[PDB]
């Protein structure tokens, strides 16, 4: 589930500065001498957690290892309360490699192009069948102990 | 075939329609968007052949073009989609340049080959696209890609099966568009849109619409002949003996016949 | 079921972007005064080395 | 007699030429002449008669008289029963003080309280406002209303009748009643009336009788068809109705002008063909639109059902109620008469949501025959696609849908009949959806033991 | 040591009986194993039904292949208890599903030479099925003839 969903996410990355600094010179030049909505996988915390309270968010990946843990704890019960579909991941350096970044607390994607909005509704789908329920009894329920 | 045998069919035929449709139904509702001259207009007829053996040996997916003298989706309710092979950026302008009278209020969309594989792949996206429109028009380039781009959404039946027309002329997409030019670009895509529609399957029954309840009784017995005469010689193999019935028809009403039969055989037998 | 903001959406998030036009007049600026290389496809930059 | 036979103010009389009138009604005619005159007016006249005008010549006649200023606070208050009503008052009100430099507002239940907090501290001159809000700002915000010279009260038998009579109790016990003109207007004469009459105006009234007196409110010759639609699909549906039965006569009734807005917007990039009829244009346009969708053979004109109230309905086919009716009986009874006509009977179409079909038993107890209107889900024209991408990349139409929105929850839950129409049954994602929303947008549906050892208070001051 | 059932939905096109036995092979052995098919075209339902000899390794194999996403199918791997297996549940199974032409044989029985009274049963039961044809359509009235 995490392949598929980094699949899709590889398919939806931001552009790097090269690329970025590539396209702004192609449109200066083509001045010298028409589009739509840019989409891309939406990060930061801040920008994340407001995207989750506002239900623009289609479905939430948090990272597993935030060394100030607080900064994430509120976060599924955020995504349960709004009711945005949310997992749970390996590695906030793989979801940093996604953005371009060394590391990234939490991505989120909101809305794709068409010809792969069905692949994200499955995704979706996945996750909540996948991920939401096998977590739906442990998720509320003390970890850890050397009880034996 | 006996001509007014057909017409006095077409006589029958009608009045049955009519009576049926102007019968009130017993649950106590009215229908909201329908009204009896809409509900008559709506209602196909249609055409059925008998052969004695099989008309094709295979399930021929591409119909084949008969021309009318009456013209059929004639009215402005009937909303068509152009799929094309190369830039369909060039035919959208090409239509943003054509005739705006008719074909371009007509033209909903048109799509590529490679936009419809990317985004019409899955099953509620091409049943949509079944749902919206109601008569498709494919590039012949392109055509033998559709039933695995439109798969048994748009296959399983026979109404709205892509027609295929010509677009080509007597590769890099962007740069050059291997076309005819415009003016007769119209005239494919217009001769195309009323046509009979003959459809090779397999076993005996070759139902063809030939018309709807709106018309006059004449055009429609002149469909008839027409239809007739171009699917025997052309479509039907070993000519003018395989022929068994020809079944005019209303889709909920019984099948009128134009019987053919002095013998059932060939020689053999 | 409803976000949490009732607050207006801004124009910002409907219409093109205005740092990048920003950034895209002064390139504009920037190669007319010949201080900087215009753009050149890649295949131009790879048959040229 | 004509508008340019009486004194009035030249700013006045060149926004009354604006709007296009000329001649007067019966109740303008005999209420305007006496109410410059300062003498309190009693009235019977019902609404569309022209009462509105025959209230505000001369409150801003007074505003111009005395030269008010916004430190002044508000001169007149004019208290309307719903906010549709309000904001029709409001744009008249607008369109009268087009010369005037006196202000106007609007203050209604459902809007912002702070915004309105900041706009009475600015000053209002001219106060249009609902009796719940209109007490809420007298009792806690801090504005200037010391120098209020006229009240009217409109549609005293609909106030009374939602149940704002305590409201307005407390609201002539706040406003001060020294020097202050009084105007009344009840289409009936209750004894709630006439109690509110005795407590507002003084000793002296003038008691004013424009009404017809053959009312045709029988309850056998009628038939009122009504067609069952969820909400998420209630707009498509009407859209498929207005794209089938072209080259005929459409009456469509909404809530609220917002909406009605919204969807001329809409329907203009959706290419069908419609003319508006909301209280967000010029008077004259009005008029022009209106008498152009009479004199044509065919074509369909969407309205408010409070902005055609006072309307001469022509014949048509089809009267369409898309949104919950205002007056129910009212709506059932005259608007079914209108819908019949006067010729070959034209029906008239209520669209039900199966939540709100209580109002069938209702019409079970009134004794009117029903029709009810199905429709296959397979001829429904499916354009919702394009319209949640049109509201998701044009900041107009957003707008609009958004306000459009806001007003039909305010006025769904501003409902006489709570009990057929109550927002808390409502399904928010699935009607946002109808306007073209994934999500639904943020919106108010609201806007034991005493004390051990407490004894009543007996003194003391409260502020 | 009772052998545990497995009923696997949601099938891709492609996992249809080799890859299905192959595996859950590797989950542990597999006693039987049937595809369910439609008649008239050979075409998988996209449902199977697998018999383990072990129903520890078939409660594994469910469990960690139940909401597996594969080839855009999110899987149904549910285990049938052992009181509701139905007897001759794997009636075709460890047999492979051939697909027959099925109107080819129709239209080559229609080319099909009958000698010589078959045709009388042909124009016999032509003759009386447009009797009732000829009833029907006289109900609301269309002469003919020959």
């Known amino acids: 589930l995490a392949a598929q969903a980094f699949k899709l996410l590889n398919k939806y990355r931001p552009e790097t500065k090269q690329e970025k600094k590539e396209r702004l010179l192609r449109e200066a030049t083509a001045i010298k001498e028409v589009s739509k909505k840019p989409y891309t996988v939406k990060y930061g915390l801040n920008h994340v957690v407001g995207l989750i309270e506002n239900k623009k968010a289609s479905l939430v990946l948090i990272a597993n290892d935030v060394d100030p843990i607080e900064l994430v704890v509120f976060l599924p019960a955020l995504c349960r309360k709004m009711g945005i579909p949310y997992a749970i991941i390996k590695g906030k350096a793989r979801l940093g490699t996604l953005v371009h970044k060394k590391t990234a607390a939490v991505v989120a994607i909101t809305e794709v192009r068409s010809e792969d909005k069905n692949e994200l509704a499955k995704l979706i789908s996945a996750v909540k069948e996948g991920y939401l329920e096998k977590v739906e009894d442990t998720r509320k329920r003390w970890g850890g102990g050397i009880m034996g | 075939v006996d001509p007014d045998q057909t017409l006095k069919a077409c006589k029958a035929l009608l009045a049955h329609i009519k009576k049926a449709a102007a019968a009130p139904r017993p649950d106590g509702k009215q229908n909201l968007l329908a009204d009896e001259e809409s509900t008559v207009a709506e209602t196909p007829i249609w055409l059925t052949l008998t052969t004695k053996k099989h008309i094709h040996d295979s399930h021929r997916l591409q119909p084949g073009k008969i021309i009318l003298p009456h013209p059929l989706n004639t009215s402005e309710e009937i909303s068509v989609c152009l799929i094309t092979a190369d830039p369909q950026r060039f035919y959208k302008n090409a239509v943003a340049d054509e005739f705006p009278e008719d074909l371009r209020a007509k033209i909903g969309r048109v799509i590529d080959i490679s936009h419809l594989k990317a985004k019409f792949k899955a099953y509620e996206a091409q049943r949509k696209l079944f ?95 027409t239809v007739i005469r171009e699917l025997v010689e052309r479509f039907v193999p070993q000519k003018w003996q395989n022929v068994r019935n020809f079944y005019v028809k209303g889709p909920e009403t019984a099948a009128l016949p134009i019987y053919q039969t002095d013998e059932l055989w060939l020689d053999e037998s | 079921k409803m976000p949490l903001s009732a607050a207006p959406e801004p124009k910002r998030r409907f219409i093109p972007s205005k740092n990048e036009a920003k950034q895209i007049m002064k390139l504009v600026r920037a190669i007319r005064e010949g201080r900087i290389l215009p753009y050149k496809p890649p295949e131009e930059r790879e048959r040229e080395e | 007699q004509e508008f340019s036979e009486l004194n009035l103010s030249e700013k006045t009389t060149k926004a009354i030429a604006e709007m296009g009138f000329t001649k007067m009604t019966e109740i303008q005619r005999r209420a305007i002449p006496p109410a410059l005159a300062g003498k309190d007016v009693l009235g019977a006249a019902k609404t569309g008669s022209g009462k509105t005008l025959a209230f505000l010549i001369p409150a801003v006649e007074m505003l111009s008289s005395l030269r008010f200023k916004p430190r002044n606070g508000t001169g007149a208050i004019v208290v309307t029963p719903t906010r549709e009503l309000a904001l029709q008052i409001f744009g008249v009100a607008r369109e009268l003080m087009k010369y005037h430099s006196q202000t106007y507002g609007v203050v209604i239940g459902g809007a912002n309280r702070r915004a309105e907090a900041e706009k009475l501290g600015k000053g209002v001159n001219l106060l249009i406002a609902t009796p719940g809000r209109l007490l809420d700002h007298l009792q806690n915000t801090p504005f200037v209303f010391k120098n209020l010279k006229s009240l009217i009260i409109d549609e005293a038998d609909r106030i009374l009748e939602i149940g704002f009579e305590d409201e307005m109790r407390q609201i002539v016990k706040i406003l001060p009643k020294e020097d202050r003109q009084t105007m009344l207007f009840s289409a009936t004469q209750t004894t709630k009336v006439e109690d509110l009459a005795r407590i507002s105006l003084r000793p002296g009234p003038l008691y004013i009788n424009v009404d017809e007196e053959k009312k045709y409110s029988t309850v056998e010759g009628l038939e009122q068809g009504y067609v069952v639609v969820e909400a998420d699909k209630r ?81 048509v086919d089809w009267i369409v109620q898309f949104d919950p009716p205002d007056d129910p009986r009212d709506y059932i009874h005259r608007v079914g008469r209108t819908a019949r006509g006067n010729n070959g009977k034209g029906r008239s179409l209520l669209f039900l949501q199966p939540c709100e079909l209580g109002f069938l038993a209702h019409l079970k107890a009134a004794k009117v025959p029903v029709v009810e209107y199905d429709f296959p889900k397979n001829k429904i024209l499916n354009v919702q696609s394009q319209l949640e991408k049109l509201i998701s990349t044009n900041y107009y139409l957003n707008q609009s849908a958004k306000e459009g929105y806001r007003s039909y929850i305010h006025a769904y839950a501003s409902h006489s009949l709570r009990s057929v129409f109550d927002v808390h049954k409502l399904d928010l994602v699935k009607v946002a959806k109808s306007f073209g929303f994934s999500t639904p947008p943020r919106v108010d549906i609201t806007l034991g033991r005493r004390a051990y050892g407490s004894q009543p208070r007996q003194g003391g001051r409260y502020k | 040591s009772q052998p545990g059932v497995m009923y696997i939905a949601r099938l891709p096109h492609g996992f249809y009986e080799h890859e299905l036995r192959g595996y859950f092979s590797q989950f542990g052995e597999i006693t039987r194993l049937r595809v369910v098919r439609n008649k008239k075209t050979g075409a998988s339902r996209h449902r199977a039904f697998i018999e383990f000899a072990d129903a520890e390794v078939a409660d594994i194999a469910a469990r960690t292949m139940d909401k597996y996403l594969l080839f855009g199918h999110i899987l149904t791997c549910k285990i049938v208890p052992p009181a509701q297996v139905h007897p001759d549940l794997f009636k075709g199974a460890n047999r492979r599903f051939k697909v027959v032409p099925w109107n080819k044989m129709a239209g080559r029985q229609l080319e099909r030479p009958l000698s010589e009274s078959q045709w009388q049963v042909k124009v016999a039961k032509e003759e009386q099925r447009r009797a009732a044809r000829a009833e029907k359509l006289k109900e609301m009235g269309y002469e003919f003839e020959a």
């Open chain 4, 235 to 315: 707009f498509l549906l009407l859209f498929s109705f207005l794209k089938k039965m072209a080259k005929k006569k459409i009456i469509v009734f909404f809530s609220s002008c917002n909406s009605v807005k919204y969807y001329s917007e809409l329907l203009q990039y959706i290419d069908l063909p419609v003319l508006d009829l909301h209280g967000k244009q010029k008077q004259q346009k009005r008029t022009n639109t209106f008498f152009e969708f009479c004199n044509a053979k065919s074509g369909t004109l969407i309205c408010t059902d409070v902005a055609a109230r006072g309307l001469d309905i022509p014949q």
């Open chain 2, 131 to 225: 749902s919206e429109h109601d008569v498709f028009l494919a590039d012949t380039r392109i055509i033998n890609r559709l039933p695995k781009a439109l798969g048994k959404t748009f296959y399983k039946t026979t109404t709205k099966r892509p027609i295929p027309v010509v677009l080509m002329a007597q590769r890099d997409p962007l740069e050059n568009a291997n076309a005819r030019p415009i003016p007769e670009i119209v005239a494919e895509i217009r001769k195309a849109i009323g046509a009979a529609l003959v459809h090779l399957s397999p076993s005996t029954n070759t139902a063809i619409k030939v018309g709807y309840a709106n018309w006059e009784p004449e055009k429609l017995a002149a469909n008839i002949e």
